[model samples]
Target: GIVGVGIDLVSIPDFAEQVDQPGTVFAETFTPGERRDASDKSSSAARHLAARWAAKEAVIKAWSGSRFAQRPVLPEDIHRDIEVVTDMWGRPRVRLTGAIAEYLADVTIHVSLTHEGDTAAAVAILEAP
Candidate 1:
């Protein structure tokens, strides 16, 4: 019981600028929590947010075309049911929401995050049967 997989990479500064001074259009889509979390209050905040975005985009890509093509899933939707967190060991993992978990059961995901100087990068994997 699996569907699809996706992967994407984004620049850290680009994501920072978008969140730090996002125009009204971008601000309107996400909830207050996401905005706060994405802000560049600290290096960790920015890197984590950027990584999350990249991972979400990757997940969306893995999905069937109909799941995202027709509706044109927004960046917000990519972050909807997914969580990117760093473990004590500094590894990154994706935790799916009820909906995503249900649809992606029997599916597996792997994530990696890295930062070099001012750059932050991430990769995600969606394994389906």
Candidate 2:
């Protein structure tokens, strides 16, 4: 059964600028593996990172939706808690840890990420048996 769905969009230019600023949370928001993946030379790192950022936001929104009307208490470092990881075949997915992982223990998350032009977008769906 489906529990919730969420979507998010990000502007590549804005994200790029923000990440380059001093004391940016980019390091805290992304895992080491994610950083490496995005830093690949084939494509613009900012574009890839922007998509990952959207994925994280989408996952958070989906989790909030699953909580119904109750006020959701999220972790202090929520961005770090929801990681965007890739499978062996290079399919992206969300890997939850810390508080979010404990809360969604019985739920499965599905994620999709895309980037075109100056925009990056992501969608997430939560399901539970």
Alpha carbon lDDT of each predicted model: 0.62, 0.79
TM-score of each: 0.63, 0.83
Per-residue error for 50 in candidate 2, Å, reads 0.6
Tens digit per residue, CA lDDT, model 2, 7-116: 99998777765654334467787655655555543457767888889999898888887773148566467777889877789899788788778878888899999999
Off by over 4 Å in 2: 31-43, 68-72
Name model 1 segments beyond 4 Å from true: 1-5, 20-38, 64-78
**Alpha-carbon deviation at 129 in model 2, angstroms:** 1.0
Error of 1 at 47 (Å): 2.8
**RMSD, candidate 1, Å:** 4.6
